[PDB]
């Protein structure tokens, strides 16, 4: 059985920075370091950091006075930030710079009382954080997930309207939502394309290339990782069987029995060690040397803040 690896796969720049922020804080200040929300959506990373003394909380009211609190890479609402700010907490912010860029646009529209529409999935923390930058009652901030949601939305002033997106969406589905927004609201303003980041775009392109060759695709990533679920969905829509797995224990032998080509990729929050263990289990089940596919080169790095070197 041949094993192909997607390229790029695995950690993006925002995840590598966020994990280093929690590790460096643990190193500088000792346990406990409080973290608002799982720092990235990956059980192995999160379990690791917990066992080293990070404590993951959903609400600032769970954190003690005098503590160090880190916001997760997915970002937080102004309400959460202000609630931390008014408490006796030392705060470090691991929000990815590419999420912060969208937050600033939302805040600018709020200041103007001009309405804004976010394309994203209800309840996800990045959506809570982004919708949470808008606060002007004169204006409005609306969430749409699909074309049908666009078809039902009505706004106060469709002449002064902009749109933003979640950074980890399906490139193809978001394209359809934007086409709907422009047909319903011809004066709507947005970025040239969307706010989907380089890493989500790149991993989706790499999985499309992988699934062209492979009969079965394994995506390493946790169940609550949105971007990892998009990679599995992409391969499934191409007619391949595709499974989202946390680690090599999750592989069922029936999934690869008599499969001639199996592909492996990893979401933006999954460490490479998990991919190595998956490759080792596929070898136990018959596969040969893993072959990396040629892929778009990534070169962006985001540094930790100097207070945490
Ligand atoms: C921090 C982010 C993504 C890195 O991957 P993740 O699995 O932690 O998060 P989602 O794909 O947003 O669920 C959201 S920008
Ligand atoms: S998925 Fe994109 S926006 Fe999110 S942390 Fe990674 S680089 Fe940043």
From Swiss-Prot:
What is a GO molecular function of this protein? 4 iron, 4 sulfur cluster binding
Q: Could you name the active-site residues?
A: 126 (proton donor)
BP terms from Gene Ontology = dimethylallyl diphosphate biosynthetic process; isopentenyl diphosphate biosynthetic process, methylerythritol 4-phosphate pathway; terpenoid biosynthetic process
The record describes its quaternary structure and partners as:
Homodimer.
Q: What is the lineage of its organism?
A: Bacteria, Pseudomonadati, Pseudomonadota, Gammaproteobacteria, Enterobacterales
Question: Which residues does the record give as isopentenyl diphosphate binding sites?
Answer: 41, 74, 124, 225-227, 269
- Disruption of the gene: reported phenotype: Cells lacking this gene are viable only if the medium is supplemented with mevalonate or the cells are complemented with an episomal copy of ispH. A conditional E.coli lytB mutant shows that LytB is essential for survival and that depletion of LytB results in cell lysis.
- In terms of superkingdom, the source organism counts as Bacteria
The record's pH note reads: Optimum pH is 7.0.
**Cofactors (names):** [4Fe-4S] cluster
EC class name: oxidoreductase
Please provide an example of a Pfam family that matches this protein in its UniProt record: LYTB
Described by its record, this protein's role is as follows: Catalyzes the conversion of 1-hydroxy-2-methyl-2-(E)-butenyl 4-diphosphate (HMBPP) into a mixture of isopentenyl diphosphate (IPP) and dimethylallyl diphosphate (DMAPP). Acts in the terminal step of the DOXP/MEP pathway for isoprenoid precursor biosynthesis. In vitro, can also hydrate acetylenes to aldehydes and ketones via anti-Markovnikov/Markovnikov addition.
Query: Per UniProt, what does mutating residue 99 to A do?
Result: No effect on catalytic activity
Q: What name appears for this protein in its UniProt entry?
A: 4-hydroxy-3-methylbut-2-enyl diphosphate reductase
Organism per entry: Escherichia coli (strain K12)
Q: List membrane-spanning regions.
A: none
**Family assignment?**
Belongs to the IspH family.
